[PDB]
Design a protein around this ligand. Structure first.
Ligand SMILES: [Ca+2]
Ligand SMILES: [Ca+2]
Ligand SMILES: [Ca+2]
Length: 240
């Protein structure tokens, strides 16, 4: 297996459309990826099925920005639309509320309630089916994308204070809006009836995502990126 340990938190259930918010302080060092994303599980299987995914990824070499993306097409022939958005304070220096909205008509990205991207059109028409909400922390082998991996910066931690998921309820949300809050997880514990911890990896990722690196402490869920064999979190959870 691999020489580093990362983590992936994922909802056990997938949904069709919705609004998803996560209050997070992201991880960043050259070479890392710290994310929030919607994912249709199995998209990675190259049997001809479609790929359905929407991303927020902080690329470690540039902590003051995040990359947005929609991945459609299919495995081995993806259609993407990478864009970048400034975040202030930098993503690894403060908590921000990251939002994703996905409806039949558009996908929208927000930071602290402010829109940073809204996409319509072809890829949106191909985000069919369901997607679960996921968060992961890893390191990409593409130095051009994330920077050379600086192992001396390990361990790194991504903190998730809370998550809110809203159902798509067109014209029936508060004040005629299109979403209605469905559930909130404040992360006082790891709720195993709601979430799973990933134990797998993929090509281009130099880490094994492992359940060893998801921690529950002081009201937050913590994802860690560590050298293999150094899986621990003995720091202080930041205040939000
Ligand atoms: Ca290195
Ligand atoms: Ca909390
Ligand atoms: Ca697992």
């Amino acid at each position: 297996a691999k020489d580093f340990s990362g983590a992936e938190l994922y909802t056990l259930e997938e949904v069709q459309y919705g609004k998803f918010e996560a209050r997070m302080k992201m991880a960043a060092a050259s070479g890392t990826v710290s994310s929030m994303f919607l994912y249709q599980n199995g998209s990675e299987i190259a049997d001809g099925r479609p790929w359905v995914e929407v991303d927020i990824e902080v690329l470690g070499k540039n902590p003051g920005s995040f990359q947005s993306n929609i991945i459609t097409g299919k495995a081995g022939a993806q259609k993407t639309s990478e864009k970048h958005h400034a975040v202030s304070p930098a993503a690894d220096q403060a908590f921000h509320t990251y939002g994703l909205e996905w409806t039949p008509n558009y996908v929208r990205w927000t930071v602290d309630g402010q829109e940073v991207r809204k996409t319509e059109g072809g890829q949106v028409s191909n985000l069919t089916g369901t997607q679960g909400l996921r968060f992961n922390l890893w390191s990409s082998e593409s130095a051009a994308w994330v920077g050379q991996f600086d192992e001396s910066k390990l361990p790194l931690f991504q903190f998730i204070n809370w998550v809110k998921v809203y159902k798509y309820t067109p014209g029936q949300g508060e004040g005629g809006s299109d979403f209605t809050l469905d559930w909130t997880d404040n992360f006082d514990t790891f709720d195993g009836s709601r979430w799973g911890k990933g134990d797998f990896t993929f090509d281009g990722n130099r880490v094994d995502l492992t359940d060893k690196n998801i921690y529950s402490r002081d009201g937050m869920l913590i994802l860690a990126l560590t050298r293999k064999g150094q899986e621990s979190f003995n720091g202080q959870v930041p205040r939000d």
